[PDB]
Scaffold this active site. Structure first.
Site, short mmCIF file in Angstrom:
data_model
loop_
_atom_site.label_atom_id
_atom_site.label_comp_id
_atom_site.label_asym_id
_atom_site.label_seq_id
_atom_site.Cartn_x
_atom_site.Cartn_y
_atom_site.Cartn_z
N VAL A 175 43.07 48.61 84.32
CA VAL A 175 42.76 49.82 83.57
C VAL A 175 43.49 51.00 84.20
O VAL A 175 43.43 51.18 85.42
N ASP A 219 28.41 43.83 77.47
CA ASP A 219 28.80 44.23 78.82
C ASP A 219 28.25 45.63 79.07
O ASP A 219 28.96 46.52 79.53
#
Ligand SMILES: Nc1nc2c(ncn2[C@@H]2O[C@H](COP(=O)(O)OP(=O)(O)OP(=O)(O)O)[C@@H](O)[C@H]2O)c(=O)[nH]1
Lengths: 468, 572
Positions: free
Chosen positions: A25, A133
């Site tokens: 990320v 998640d």
């Protein structure tokens, strides 16, 4: 990770946000602003990434209308011959950082953040999206305390084998924090495991995930379950009693305890929790005005910082009537101050700059002394460096009047006067603009007298504390 | 949702920075909560391995933020390492912070008993942390706790100590393991020569333990009598070993002498002995030794296979070794037992086979026998590991003709041993030291070369032999991939606990284990090098994969095994 942005001309690499075996990320600059890019390196091209891309596009269409839900807006199958990339809007703070970044969230802000998390889950369920998640690292908070659940990762495996969890390091543990906000029912006995990658998530599963995220917020950044405690929870060998006992707010604690429940049949729907805690853990003001009013600012139609100040100014009378009534009403005002303060740094017009000061002057008499010194005081000194001389003068006028209302000095601001107030306006006494020096001469006497009142209070408090 | 404050300075944080940076504002460290930047740096600091030298900046920061670090149970170890005990004002604060910290994990509390913590309030506290551990965990660490006596103040014993002793008087399983550990140090003549104060201390330790047991009740005195009986039994085995060792001749004559002597209860009193808890496993009560089954192995030291008569009439097998220093194995097998416990803590059951080892003297002791066939015999008789498994665990529905469950235990156990052998750097990789069971369990024997000591030129980095890989079905098999996935899992799990491993090895620096005593200051450091904490998770897995390729292409490994086989054939 930055090397992958060299092929995307519309995105300019800015910083790396994290690297795991599953997703890397990084933050990049785009014509629309800052964006978070999760790059999945394609090692085996025979993987059916088209099926996952179609699933992501379905998620975008299903979540496009959710105000508190942020789906992946772009999925690129062959962005580069080496990796597939997912793109979504960047939010100022993630919940994991927001807990440790000042101003520290007050009880009213903590309730508001929890309320928005539940609203995000409720909205996602009605929109047909399950997160899978839900963790404190995925519940984002905007500069105005607007919560946006982001990073919908339907590509992550739903089910993990209980007996061979090591295979979860790439699917679930990208961040190496060992924090597990997966629903207990998603761990399954390894004799079954040796399409759970995308088994259809039960709503009770998201409620479990939200409970872990909601718990971390109430545990001062303390995770609710570690891998050993969570697996022990499924197997009955672990219970995070120490962390749950760490939720100081009894009303917030009850909501958290029920949502992370190990048995899916005990998890309610998102809408039911909001109704159960309506008036208890979440004051009524959140549903009737805070949520509907605030929703205008999270809309796709961009309100510039100048426009936001004017909108808040226009509604100021209604906001005070809605938050204070005719008259615990101050509990709502902590959240209100956050909308104004998020804009003061980006104001462009002089009309707006004066308007921002008008709002502060009208709200200042209605805020708690702690909020005045922590959330209002820092912004007035920022305005004192504005390019408009009228604004510099008004900043001094505003600061002088705001400070005269401080009747109690917080422990963190005992030396605020000699090091922040007095040194912060000292540059105004010599400003090039005669209007500024005039505002200085007109207020220098008042500023000094206000600081003197503060010193007398600190001395009296110290004398009383020494006699305690 | 466009946010205007996206790229602007946090004015609220800047304000608190100006007041917190003011030297006029007296340090209010009690209410100071670190900002995100400080927390990220703090997390790195609290995670440092015990061998990393801390800079001055961490101690001042932790002190400055001392009231903030009080919420990390694992930070008490790092905070106290930063405190400059030379300043009494700082010490008073340092001791004040210790009392408020959230009680740390017992696994970490072993670090406070090492020689590095000298403060009596800190050591009495460290005992207070160990005071909360369950006896079942203490038994896994008693080997390290007794070594920790090397760091305690010898004068209090001659006059923390009361805590360790208090638990043993209540639980016999601990008392057994503690007793033999204290006896081993009381007999180490090398310690008497190298550190006579410590040897006399150990004499005092053995004596003190006896004094505490003596003050107990009749049942405790009975416990004492069992230890006295235990002493006679081990002494008999040593004398028997000397009588058997003096007999010059072939294995058959020595075996007959061993069995006859064990049978001759009138002279050796080993065929029928009083009820004694077994030295190898104090949980099992024994009545004597079976004489007819005692046999001497064909090793240079000729170990004795002994079958002990249990209270219920069963047979408990134990091995008594003479001529070898089993203390190294005792510690190592404790480490293997601990590695196994950590993996199971995360539900990662690598199906490890931790065989028990007990040193009864600096030269002899009892070791548990685990049912296995030597790889040298398996390779000579069946040709391949698959033929061996097909003979003992045939499954028509399983992988490679072996039951899938049996193959699963084999893959997990092979991986577990493979990872532990890489972590410990086992050098003596001869085919005689790998034992394979019919149930798929794999275990290592004869740890004569550890800590990287390898007499052979260009040793392979990891213990993965061509026969072992062929045992998993080859580079194209599903099990070979399942093995590798388990290795990555175990590597990452142990990487997370590298602090515990380094904490335990630190307590063994003053423990004269042959490979530790060679470089005691570097003993704790050698374990850190095996954890490879300097690499990221991605690089570590990339490294482990590279390691398998580097080990598989080591053609020279096959040549050294053939040369060793030729030398063993000439010696036999
Ligand atoms: N301040 C800030 N932090 C971000 C932003 N985007 C991501 N992060 C954080 O950077 C890290 C990125 O890792 P993630 O993959 O999102 O971690 P995760 O939420 O546990 O995993 P997922 O459930 O798959 O999203 C996390 O700590 C995020 O909170 C952002 O836009 N602003």
């Amino acid at each position: 990770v930055e090397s992958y942005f060299s092929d995307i001309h519309d995105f300019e690499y800015d910083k790396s946000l994290g690297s795991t075996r599953f997703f890397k990320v990084a933050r990049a600059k785009h014509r629309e602003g800052l964006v978070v890019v999760k790059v999945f390196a394609i090692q085996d091209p025979t993987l059916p990434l088209t099926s996952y891309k179609q699933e992501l596009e379905e998620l975008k269409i299903r979540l496009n209308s959710a105000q508190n839900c942020l789906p992946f807006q772009k999925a690129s199958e062959k962005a580069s011959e080496k990796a597939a990339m997912l793109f979504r809007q960047y939010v100022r703070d993630n919940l994991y950082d927001r807990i440790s970044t000042r101003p520290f969230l007050n009880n009213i802000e903590k309730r508001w953040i929890a309320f928005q998390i539940l609203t995000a889950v409720d909205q996602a369920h009605k929109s047909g999206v399950r997160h899978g998640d839900i963790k404190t690292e995925n519940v984002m908070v905007t500069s105005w305390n607007w919560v946006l659940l982001t990073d919908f990762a339907s590509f992550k495996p739903t089910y993990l084998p209980e007996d061979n969890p090591a295979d979860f390091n790439y699917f679930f543990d990208t961040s190496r924090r060992r924090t597990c906000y997966i629903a207990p029912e998603r761990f399954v006995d390894g004799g079954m495991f040796a399409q759970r990658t995308r088994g259809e998530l039960k709503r009770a599963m998201d409620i479990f995930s939200a409970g872990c995220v909601i718990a971390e917020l109430f545990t001062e950044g303390v995770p609710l379950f570690d891998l050993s405690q969570l697996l022990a929870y499924r197997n009955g060998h672990f219970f995070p009693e120490q962390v749950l006992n760490k939720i100081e707010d009894h009303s917030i604690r009850e909501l958290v305890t029920q949502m992370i429940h190990r048995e899916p049949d005990k998890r309610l729907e998102a809408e039911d929790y909001l109704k159960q805690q309506r008036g208890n853990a979440f004051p009524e003001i959140f549903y009737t005005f805070l949520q509907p009013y605030m929703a205008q600012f999270a809309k796709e139609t961009f309100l510039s910082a100048d426009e936001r100040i004017l909108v808040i100014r226009k509604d100021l009378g209604n906001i005070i009537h809605n938050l204070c009534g005719h008259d615990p009403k101050e509990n709502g005002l902590v959240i209100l101050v956050s909308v104004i303060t998020s804009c003061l740094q980006t104001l462009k017009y002089c009309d707006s700059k004066l308007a921002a000061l008008e709002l502060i002057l009208h709200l200042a008499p209605r805020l708690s002394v702690e909020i005045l010194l922590d959330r209002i005081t820092p912004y007035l000194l920022h305005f004192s460096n504005d390019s408009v001389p009228r604004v510099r003068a008004e900043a001094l006028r505003t600061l002088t009047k705001v400070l005269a209302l401080v009747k109690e000095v917080p422990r963190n601001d005992i030396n605020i006067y000699p090091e922040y107030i007095l040194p912060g306006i000292a540059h105004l006494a010599q400003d090039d603009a005669t209007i500024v020096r005039l505002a200085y001469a007109e207020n220098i006497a008042l500023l000094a007298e206000t600081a003197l009142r503060f010193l007398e209070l600190v001395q009296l408090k110290n004398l009383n504390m020494e006699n305690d | 949702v466009p946010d205007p404050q996206m790229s602007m300075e946090n004015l609220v944080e800047s304000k608190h920075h100006k007041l917190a940076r003011s030297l006029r504002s007296g340090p209010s460290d009690h209410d100071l909560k670190p900002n995100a930047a400080t927390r990220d740096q703090l997390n790195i600091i609290v995670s440092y391995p015990p061998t990393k030298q801390l800079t001055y900046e961490e101690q001042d920061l932790v002190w400055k933020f001392r009231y903030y670090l009080t919420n990390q149970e694992k930070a008490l170890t790092k905070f106290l390492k930063c405190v400059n005990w030379d300043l009494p004002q700082e010490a008073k604060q340092a001791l004040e912070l210790l009392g408020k910290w959230k009680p740390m994990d017992v696994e970490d509390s072993l670090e406070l008993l090492s020689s590095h913590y000298t403060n009596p309030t800190v050591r009495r506290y460290a005992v207070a942390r160990l005071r909360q551990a369950d006896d079942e965990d203490l038994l896994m660490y008693l080997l390290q706790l007794v070594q920790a006596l090397k760091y305690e103040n010898f004068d209090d014993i001659k006059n923390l100590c009361t805590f360790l002793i208090s638990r043993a008087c209540k639980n016999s399983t601990l008392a057994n393991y503690l007793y033999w550990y204290v006896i081993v140090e009381c007999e180490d003549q090398d310690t008497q020569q190298r550190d006579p104060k410590t040897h006399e201390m150990y004499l005092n330790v053995m004596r003190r333990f006896s004094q505490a047991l003596l003050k107990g009740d009749k049942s405790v005195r009975v416990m004492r009598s069992l230890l006295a009986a235990q002493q006679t039994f081990v002494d008999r085995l040593v004398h028997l070993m000397k009588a058997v060792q003096r007999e010059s001749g072939n294995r058959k004559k020595k075996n007959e002498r061993l069995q006859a002597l064990l049978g001759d209860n009138e002279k050796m009193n080993l065929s029928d002995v009083e009820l004694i808890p077994l030295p190898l496993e104090p949980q099992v009560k024994i009545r004597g030794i079976i004489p007819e089954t005692a046999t001497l192995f064909k090793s240079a030291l000729m170990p004795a296979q002994l079958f002990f008569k249990t209270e219920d009439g069963g047979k408990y097998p134990v091995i008594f070794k003479h001529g070898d220093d089993l203390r190294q194995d005792q510690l190592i097998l404790q480490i293997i037992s601990l590695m196994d416990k950590l993996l199971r803590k995360e539900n990662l059951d690598l199906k490890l086979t931790p065989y028990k080892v007990l040193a009864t003297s600096t030269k002899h002791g009892f070791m548990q026998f685990i049912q296995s066939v030597p790889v040298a015999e398996v390779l000579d008789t069946e040709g391949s590991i698959q033929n061996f498994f097909r003979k003992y665990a045939p499954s028509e529905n399983g992988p490679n003709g072996i039951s899938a469950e049996v193959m699963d235990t084999y893959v997990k156990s092979c991986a577990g041993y493979c990872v532990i052998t890489y972590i410990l750097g086992v050098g003596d990789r001869h085919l005689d030291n790998l034992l394979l069971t019919k149930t798929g369990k794999l275990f290592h024997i004869d740890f004569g070369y550890i800590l990287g000591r390898d007499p052979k030129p260009l040793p392979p980095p990891m213990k993965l032999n061509k026969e072992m890989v062929e045992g998993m079905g080859g580079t194209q098999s599903e099990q070979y991939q399942e093995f590798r996935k388990q290795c990555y899992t175990a590597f990452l799990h142990l990487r997370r606990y590298s602090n515990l491993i380094l904490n335990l090895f630190s307590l063994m620096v003053d423990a004269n284990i042959p490979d530790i005593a060679l470089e005691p200051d570097k003993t704790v450091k050698k374990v850190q090098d095996k954890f490879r904490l300097d690499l990221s998770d991605e690089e570590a897995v990339h490294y482990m994969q590279s390691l398998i390729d580097e080990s598989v292409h080591a053609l020279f490994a096959a040549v050294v095994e053939q040369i060793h086989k030729f030398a063993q054939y000439w010696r036999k």
